[PDB]
Design a protein around this ligand. Structure first.
Ligand SMILES: OC[C@H]1O[C@@H](O[C@H]2[C@H](O)[C@@H](O)[C@H](O)O[C@@H]2CO)[C@H](O)[C@@H](O)[C@@H]1O
Ligand SMILES: [Ca+2]
Ligand SMILES: [Ca+2]
Ligand SMILES: [Cl-]
Ligand SMILES: [Cl-]
Ligand code: NA
Length: 130
């Protein structure tokens, strides 16, 4: 069912953010200090999509005050796959998993995330079949 899990800190390029220790399950790091304009590229780790169609994209997120949103896309900015609002979770290290669906073409993808509004932290992303 799982196509890929990508730890958010395992980006090949980024803008505007910093990693920090997470107390979420599994430990490790999350991406923090996210604001409008910031972005994360996973171009260095292309992900293979086996067939064209609907995929479920999950994000492990934390947000003290809510109000954030992101765009999931190809690295570089286009095509855009989808957008998602990031809810308040109650704290910077109070974690939850949110999800949406997007259409993806078959083949090798180089994904990216653009923050449209800040206020949240990101631990990992997961791409699943539907
Ligand atoms: O999709 C995220 C973000 O990508 C930015 O382009 C990056 C690209 O992600 C990276 O792999 C490449 O090496 O460098 C360029 C930046 O020069 C793009 O500028 C953003 O608009 C986009 O949101
Ligand atoms: Ca920032
Ligand atoms: Ca992580
Ligand atoms: Cl917390
Ligand atoms: Cl912001
Ligand atoms: Na696509």
């Amino acid at each position: 069912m799982v196509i890929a899990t990508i730890q958010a800190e395992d980006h090949s390029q980024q803008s505007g953010t910093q990693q920090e220790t997470t107390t979420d399950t599994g430990g490790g790091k999350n991406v923090g200090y996210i604001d409008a304009g910031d972005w994360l590229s996973y171009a260095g780790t292309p992900v293979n999509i086996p067939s064209s169609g609907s995929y479920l994209i999950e994000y492990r997120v934390a947000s003290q005050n809510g109000g954030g949103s992101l765009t999931f896309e190809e690295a570089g900015g286009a095509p855009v796959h989808g957008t998602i609002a990031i809810p308040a979770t109650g704290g910077w290290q109070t974690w939850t998993t949110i999800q949406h669906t997007v259409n993806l073409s078959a083949g090798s993808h180089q994904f990216g995330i653009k923050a449209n509004a800040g206020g949240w932290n990101l631990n990992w992303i997961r791409i699943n079949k539907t």
